[PDB]
């Protein structure tokens, strides 16, 4: 009733008091966005886009030199990583062409809402912008059955930069403005690379068209062109990390804020770039499951 609004006001007061403590939002906020888990969404991609078979894509990537037979350990390691993600056939398997957008549309959302209004549909647009691999023209990614799990992409241990647009729609098919809703940019690993290639792999979010809220104590810092990443290893204590990757980078760790930053939405069309260097495989989840401590849910009406 108002029991809630009182608890909301109390938690917000505590959040301002504990601003500077590890894991708290540096600026207190509440959460109006509920976009947490959608395991039974319907995924649709336009017939113009080729959704690859497992063997088909395997042969194609091998044809580019990313093969288990390649004498260059970088390329055979690139393959090994690629094979692991290509083995999950619940993903839609895509080859992105540079500057050619691809929409992945999720419908029949069951669990999601913004400020009491049901979210029925979310559309992701993926556009490869740059890659260090071969002639810079193509790269593989994998679109999840669940829009909150979202995507894996590759860089074949070079680098990749993919723009993502996100648009959410209500029951009436209208574009929703989720301004003020909070999104989780999580698991932004640095230093978790292949020791055979380069441990200093870097996962980042670039060109975010919202406003980041730094999490106090987090390894993830903001940089020019609204780009969030760590400045040194958050993977190994022996290279300065507070925790080894396995101690913080899970959905269940109380330390998982250590590799995270919060994004506050400011536009109906959300935009950011997923970017990696020397990572092989990158899991990029986009959801409202913020890792920060003491963020109350904003009550409705
Ligand atoms: Mg990660």
Swiss-Prot record:
The domain of life is: Bacteria
Where in or outside the cell it occurs: the entry states: Secreted, Cell wall
Q: Per UniProt, where does Ca(2+) 1 bind? A: 187, 189, 203
Q: To which protein family does this belong?
A: Belongs to the antigen I/II family.
Miscellaneous note of the record: S.gordonii, a commensal oral cavity bacteria, is among the bacteria most frequently identified as being the primary etiological agents of subacute infective endocarditis (found in 13% of cases).
Q: What does this protein do?
A: May bind sialic acid residues of salivary agglutinin (SAG) in a calcium-dependent reaction. The interaction of SAG with its receptor in various oral streptococci modulate bacterial colonization of oral tissue and is associated with reduced levels of dental caries.
Subunit note: Interacts with P.gingivalis fimbrial protein Mfa1.
Protein's UniProt name: Agglutinin receptor
Q: What organism does this protein naturally occur in?
A: Streptococcus gordonii
Q: In the record, what lineage is assigned to the organism producing the protein?
A: Bacteria, Bacillati, Bacillota, Bacilli, Lactobacillales
Residue range from the parent sequence: 462 to 762 of 1500
